[PDB]
Amino acid sequence: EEVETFAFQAEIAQLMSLIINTFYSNKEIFLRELISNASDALDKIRYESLTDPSKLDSGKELKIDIIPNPQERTLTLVDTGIGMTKADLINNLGTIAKSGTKAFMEALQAGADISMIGQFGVGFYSAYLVAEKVVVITKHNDDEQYAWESSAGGSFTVRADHGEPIGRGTKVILHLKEDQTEYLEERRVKEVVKKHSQFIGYPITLYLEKE
Numbered sequence: 001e002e003v004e005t006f007a008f009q010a011e012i013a014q015l016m017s018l019i020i021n022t023f024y025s026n027k028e029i030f031l032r033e034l035i036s037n038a039s040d041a042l043d044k045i046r047y048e049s050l051t052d053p054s055k056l057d058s059g060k061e062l063k064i065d066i067i068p069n070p071q072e073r074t075l076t077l078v079d080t081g082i083g084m085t086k087a088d089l090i091n092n093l094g095t096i097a098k099s100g101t102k103a104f105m106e107a108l109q110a111g112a113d114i115s116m117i118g119q120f121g122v123g124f125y126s127a128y129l130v131a132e133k134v135v136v137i138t139k140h141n142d143d144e145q146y147a148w149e150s151s152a153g154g155s156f157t158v159r160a161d162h163g164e165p166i167g168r169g170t171k172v173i174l175h176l177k178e179d180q181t182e183y184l185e186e187r188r189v190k191e192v193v194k195k196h197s198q199f200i201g202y203p204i205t206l207y208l209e210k211e
């Protein structure tokens with residue numbers, strides 16, 4: 001459909017540049033942060049479903065799938081959580097991330113570690129430790145399916161997605177940088193998940209490569 005391009009908030013662009021440009025070997029933290037976000041989104045639909053059960057008509061299973069695709073050089077995290085509205089994508093989430101971003105940057109200047117990004121609520125952006133491009137497909141009840149995409153550089157796009165319906169939730173598609181293909185391997189993904197994400201209350205299925 002028609003693609004709309006937007007500038008990130010100045011503070012968010014700056015955090016993204018920092019994540020992309022800083023020498024920082026502990027890149028695997030991205031996966032814990034994205035799992036955390038997926039888990040939060042599942043909590044939200046589960047909670048809402050307690051006062052409006054019809055919110056689960058778009059899909060009853062609450063789960064997280066992690067899917068490596070070597071041929072495409074993608075690692076995808078799929079959740080069946082609440083999903084994001086257009087307003088979330090374009091404005092609202094970035095608006096709330098502003099204050100967390102500022103505090104995190106301040107902590108970094110005062111000697112904090114990039115692994116504390118989650119404690120500031122802006123862990124999503126750690127995706128850029130490993131991805132050159134992130135595509136996000138998302139569907140909230142009573143809104144339509146959207147595709148968001150950013151290769152950083154200060155901007156992102158949003159468009160109506162006409163791909164396969166996901167029913168409800170979010171797919172985070174990480175287009176990995178060339179030297180980060182370890183996150184496509186079985187043992188590596190399992191090792192990182194076990195390490196950092198032991199106590200998440202929804203089933204996480206780590207899919208295997210077919211070839």
Ligand SMILES: Nc1nc2sc(CNC3CCN(C[C@](O)(Cn4cncn4)c4ccc(F)cc4F)CC3)cc2n(-c2ccc3c(c2)N(c2ccccc2)CCO3)c1=O
Pocket residue numbers: 037038040041044079081082083084085088089090092093094096097100120121122123124136148170
């Ligand atoms: N798989 C996921 N599914 C879901 S569904 C949902 C809506 N539901 C909302 C999410 C917001 N919640 C509030 C809060 O959690 C509060 N808070 C503030 N400070 C610490 N906590 C929050 C967290 C981060 C933030 F920027 C703004 C916030 F208001 C309440 C329910 C959000 C969401 N995301 C997600 C999570 C964090 C993100 C982003 C996405 N982004 C993002 C990512 C791609 C494109 C555009 C934008 C960039 C900011 O960060 C997931 O990744």
Ligand SMILES: [Cl-]
Pocket residue numbers: 007008009012094095
């Ligand atoms: Cl923004």
Ligand SMILES: [Cl-]
Pocket residue numbers: 048
């Ligand atoms: Cl609510």
Ligand SMILES: [Cl-]
Pocket residue numbers: 085086087088143
């Ligand atoms: Cl909206």
Ligand SMILES: [Cl-]
Pocket residue numbers: 048055140141
């Ligand atoms: Cl809903």
Ligand SMILES: [Cl-]
Pocket residue numbers: 205206207208
């Ligand atoms: Cl498996």
